[PDB]
Amino acid sequence: GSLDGRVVFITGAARGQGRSHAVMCAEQGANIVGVDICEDIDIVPYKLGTYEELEETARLVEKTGQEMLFRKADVRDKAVLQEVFDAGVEQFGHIDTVIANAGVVLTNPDERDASEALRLGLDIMLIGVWNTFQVAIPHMKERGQGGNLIATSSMIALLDLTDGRGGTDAYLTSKLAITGLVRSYALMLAADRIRVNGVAPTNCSTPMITENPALFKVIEENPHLVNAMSTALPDFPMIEPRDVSNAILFLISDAGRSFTGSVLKVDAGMDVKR
Amino acid sequence: GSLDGRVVFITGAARGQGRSHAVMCAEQGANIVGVDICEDIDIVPYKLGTYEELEETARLVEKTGQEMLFRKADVRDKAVLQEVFDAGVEQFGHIDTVIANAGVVLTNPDERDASEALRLGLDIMLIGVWNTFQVAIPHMKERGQGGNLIATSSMIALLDLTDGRGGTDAYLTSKLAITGLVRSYALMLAADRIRVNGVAPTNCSTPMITENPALFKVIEENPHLVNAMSTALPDFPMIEPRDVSNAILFLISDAGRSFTGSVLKVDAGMDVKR
Ligand SMILES: NC(=O)c1ccc[n+]([C@@H]2O[C@H](COP(=O)([O-])OP(=O)(O)OC[C@H]3O[C@@H](n4cnc5c(N)ncnc54)[C@H](O)[C@@H]3O)[C@@H](O)[C@H]2O)c1
Ligand SMILES: NC(=O)c1ccc[n+]([C@@H]2O[C@H](COP(=O)([O-])OP(=O)(O)OC[C@H]3O[C@@H](n4cnc5c(N)ncnc54)[C@H](O)[C@@H]3O)[C@@H](O)[C@H]2O)c1
C-alpha cells in the first residue's frame, strides 16, 4: 500500500474520523499509535469516546495485518502525550506522521459559564493540536526522514457562524487558528522535509453530530444560523469519515507528495454554497 | 482502476501536463478525447505542441489498453471544440470528465504589442477555458450521470507577480479568473451532480518553462520578481506533470468524491513561501 513502512500518531482514535484514519492508514501498510481521552467531560453535552471503542479501533487495525499501540490520553496533557509518542517510537522504531484529530463540539443552549467553555475549547482544539505537533517535531527532525503533520480544522468554523457563546467561539477560533499553524509550520519545517497540511470537513456522520441534540437546538434558535450546515452536493448532506481519511491519505502519500501548507476542503461544496 | 468506464476530454494533450493527464487517466481505465492546437503562435516565444506529439500521446494511451480520439483543434474555436467533443460522445458513448488544460506563457521582454498579447492570452486561457466547459455541460446534464470539470489555474499567477506587459497580465488575470469560474460553476452545477474543481500548479518541468529563455530574462530583468518562482520544499524546485495528474485523479475519483469548488495547490509550498 501507499503507507508501507509508515507509522502514524493519531489523537482522538476511539471512534469517528480518528478511527477511520487509523483503520484506513493501516490498510495502506501503516502501523498506528493512537490516543483518546476515553472519558466524558462535564460541559460537553454528548458522550465522548470510550476505552472500549479505542480497543475496537486497535482490533480493526490488527485485522488489516498491521499493529496499533493504543493508550488513554488527553491532548491537554502534553507530557502524557509525549510519553505515548515515545512508547510509539520504541515499539515501532519511529513515528513519521501525525494526525491532530481530537476535538469536541461545545454548542449548547444550556451553557453554564461562557468563559469556562471558551477556555476548555481552546485548550483541547488549539493548544491540544499545538501539543500534538510539539511532541513529534524533535523526533521527526532527529530521524531526518522528513515526515507529515496533519491538523483537522472545520469548514463550518471557516464560514464565520457563531452564537457568541463561549463554546461556539472556542470552536470557531481554534479551528481557524490551526489553519495558521498549518501554513506557518509548513514554511518553518519545509527545510526538514516535514510537510504540513490540514483538512476542513463539512458535517461528518459521527456522534459529535449524530448524538448531540444540543447542536440542532442552537441552529434552530438563531435566525442567522438557519442554513449553517447545508452543503452543495445533493448526495452529501453530510460526508462520511472515510472521505476525510481519503483526503489525508492523498496528502501524506506519494500521490500528494508536493503538498504542504494546504487545507483541503472536504466539504461537498459548502464553501461555495450561497 | 479508479476511472473504469470513464471518458475524459482534455485540451492541450500534445505534451506536458495534458499528455500526463491523458496517459495517467488511461492507466486508471479511462478512454480519452484529446485536442491540441498543433501549431506555433507568432507572439508566443517558444515552440508549441505538434501533431506528432499529439499522435505520440495517443500511442502512449493505447499502450495502456485504452483508446484515444485525438484531433488538431484550437480552444479558441468553440464550434470545432464542440465538434471534437461530439465525435467523442459518438466514439465512446459519453464524456463525463473535462480537463481545461491548454495554455501558453506570454512572458517576453521583446513583446511587440501589449494590447495584442493581452487579447491573445485572454482568448486562450480565459475564453478558451470557458469554451471548454461550455461544449460539455449540455451533454453532462442531458446524460444525467453527473460529471467532473477541471480547470488548470496557476500558483505563480495567484501570487500577484507581473511585469505589466500585456502577455503577463493576460496570464495572471485569466488564471485568477478561472478560479472564479470554478467556484461559481461548482455552485451552479451542484444540483446536476457535476463537480467542478481546479488545480494551481507551481513551476512544472515542461517546454513552456524548460525551453522558454524569454521567461528567465523577464524575472532576471525585474527586482520585485527575483524570487518569483521559488518553492518551499527542497526536493521540488519544480514539480513534474504527474504531480498535477495525481491531484486531478484524486479530485475526479471516488477518493475525492465530495470535492467541489476547490482549487488544489500543487505547489511544493510556494503559497506559504516568504
Ligand atoms: N463531525 C463533524 O461534523 C466535524 C466537522 C468538522 C470537523 N470536525 C472535527 O473532526 C475531529 C474528529 O471529530 P469526529 O467527527 O470524529 O467526532 P467524535 O467525537 O466522534 O470523535 C472525536 C474523538 O476525540 C476524542 N477526544 C475529545 N477530546 C479529547 C481530548 N482532550 N484528548 C484526547 N481525545 C479527545 C473523543 O473522545 C472522540 O473519540 C474533531 O477535531 C472535530 O472537531 C468534525
Ligand atoms: N509549466 C508550468 O510551470 C505551469 C505552471 C502553472 C500552470 N501551468 C498551466 O498548465 C497548463 C499546461 O501547460 P504545460 O505546463 O503542460 O505546458 P506545455 O506548453 O508543455 O503544454 C501546453 C499544451 O497546450 C497546447 N495549446 C496551447 N494553446 C492552445 C490552444 N489555443 N488550443 C489548444 N491547445 C493549445 C500547446 O500546444 C501544448 O501542447 C497550461 O494552462 C499552463 O498555463 C503551467
Residue numbers in the entry:
A (entry chain B), B (entry chain A): 16 to 289
Q: What do the authors say?
A:
These crystal structures demonstrate that the inserted protein residues almost completely cover the NAD cofactor, only leaving part of the nicotinamide ring exposed to solvent. NMR experiments did not show exchange of the NAD cofactor, whereas binding was demonstrated for a number of small molecules which could be potential substrates, products, inhibitors, or artificial redox partners. Experimental results are consistent with the notion that the SDR family enzymes linked by comparative genomics studies to mycofactocin do indeed keep their NAD tightly bound beneath a protein structure that may interact with a specialized adaptor machinery for redox exchange.
With the exception of the M. thermoresistibile target which did not contain NAD, all other mycobacterial SDR target crystal structures contained NAD, which appears to have co-purified with the protein after expression in E. coli. For each of these crystal structures, the adenosine mononucleotide portion of the cofactor binding site is enveloped by the inserted residues and only a portion of the nicotinamide ring appears open to solvent (see representative examples in Fig. 2A and B). In addition to the insertion loop which covers the adenosine portion of the cofactor, a second loop which typically contains two α-helices covers much of nicotinamide mononucleotide portion of the cofactor. In contrast, this loop is ordered in each of the mycobacterial SDR crystal structures presented here. The structures presented here have a cofactor solvent accessible surface area of approximately 18 Å2, whereas other NAD- or NADP-bound dehydrogenases have a cofactor solvent accessible surface area of 82–89 Å2. Given the encapsulation of the NAD cofactor by the two loops in mycobacterial SDRs, a large conformational change would be required to release the NADH cofactor after a redox reaction had occurred.
